[PDB]
Curated annotation (Swiss-Prot), chain A:
Origin species: Canavalia brasiliensis
Family: Belongs to the leguminous lectin family.
Positions of Mn(2+) binding: E8, D10, D19, H24, S34
Note: Binds one manganese (or another transition metal) ion and one calcium ion. The metal ions are essential for the saccharide-binding and cell-agglutinating activities. Is being tested as a molluscicide with potential application in controlling schistosomiasis. The causative agent of schistosomiasis depends on freshwater snails of the genus Biomphalaria as hosts during its larval stages.
Identification of the protein by name: Concanavalin-Br
Membrane-spanning intervals of the chain: none
Binding site for Ca(2+): D10, Y12, N14, D19, D205
Residue sites binding a carbohydrate per the record: Y12, L99, Y100, R225
Amino acid sequence: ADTIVAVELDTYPNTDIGDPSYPHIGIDIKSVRSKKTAKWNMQNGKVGTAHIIYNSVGKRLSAVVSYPNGDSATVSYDVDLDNVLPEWVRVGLSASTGLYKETNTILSWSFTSKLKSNSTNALHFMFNQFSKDQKDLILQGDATTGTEGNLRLTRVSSNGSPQGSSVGRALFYAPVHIWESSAVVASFEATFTFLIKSPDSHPADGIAFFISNIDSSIPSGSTGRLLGLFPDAN
Amino acid sequence: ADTIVAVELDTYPNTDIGDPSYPHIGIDIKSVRSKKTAKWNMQNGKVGTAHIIYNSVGKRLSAVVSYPNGDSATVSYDVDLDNVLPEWVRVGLSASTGLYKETNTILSWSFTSKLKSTNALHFMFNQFSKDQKDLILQGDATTGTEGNLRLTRVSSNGSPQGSSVGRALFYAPVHIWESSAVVASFEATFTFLIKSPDSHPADGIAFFISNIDSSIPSGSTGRLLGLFPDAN
Ligand SMILES: [Ca+2]
Ligand SMILES: [Ca+2]
Ligand SMILES: [Mn+2]
Ligand SMILES: [Mn+2]
């Protein structure tokens, strides 16, 4: 039912639903099977940063993930999002664990959306420290805000261990007006920083930044490879 | 019950409840009787702009209202808002008509709030739409198709009705202070058109901050500006 555009940081290759055979960053347009992907070296226990950029003029959704040693992966995809998303949306962060696991810790998250006309309406928010009672965020599933200033999208246990089978998402409280047919420029950018750590045989499954219909919720059974985004793998 | 801080653009002197005896701008802290006021020359039928500014270091709430010919009023009041507002709030615009009446038309509205230890929230409407999904409209407030916000009832011929009250609040709660931030600041800006053919215009427009669940108090038309249950 939900309408999803996402950028996925995919730590685990599910080569049976069309992942490449390596960790990857992807652009997802109404499907977990990314329209475009690139090879990502996930750096275990290090803090990475993702940037996501779109505007309605070039109509190219782009993303880049990097670490402080300077290694980065990038991915771009040509798409007119006007023809994909409702005019009003909510923006959010998603994460999963499945059979393998990992911390999915958000340390910071910022977002800007603008409509400029013919003829500016704007929304911008920036979290660099989350609080225990984040009244601006809609937490779904296992997602907690802690007292340590962080957003934990998936269940971690009191000794700091990540759990399997977990799914969590945080959405900004106010609906966003992503497009407006008489805006000449409708643009958005998002940025988050994240710590993925695992002592496991392999890390799974990743974190996503997403945009959806306003009333979006975690689809039934979207742990593991579905990243809390999609009711299935089609 | 509600906690209110407001800057009021007060077009009508109610000298019994402490207004000065001229149209005025005021700083209202938990009371319709302003802690501070300044004389304001409302220009009928002209587009005015109001700027409001606060930071937790100077601890001075300030406001200026101007018109394009460049006449302006200003008011400042020294107050630690940490001691007066909940940590979480909603921000919004309010207006009234009573026995006299006016258009209370908002043409644009922007807001910035920052906690630097930065968390930040900023919005800016230069055009409002029919279905404004990030705004909570209360009482008589509508967003029209002309890009404007009408805080008070206007009739199909474009006439302001009396005995009207309306507010718009931004949809997201705002985290206005955080005891461990060194600077918490905010401002706000809005542009407005007050028009009346009436014997006197009444009653004005306010920018306000309140508890997150604030609603129009019972009977807060006319001189209470949709902000206060009474005139204490
Ligand atoms: Ca995968
Ligand atoms: Ca008055
Ligand atoms: Mn993938
Ligand atoms: Mn007054």
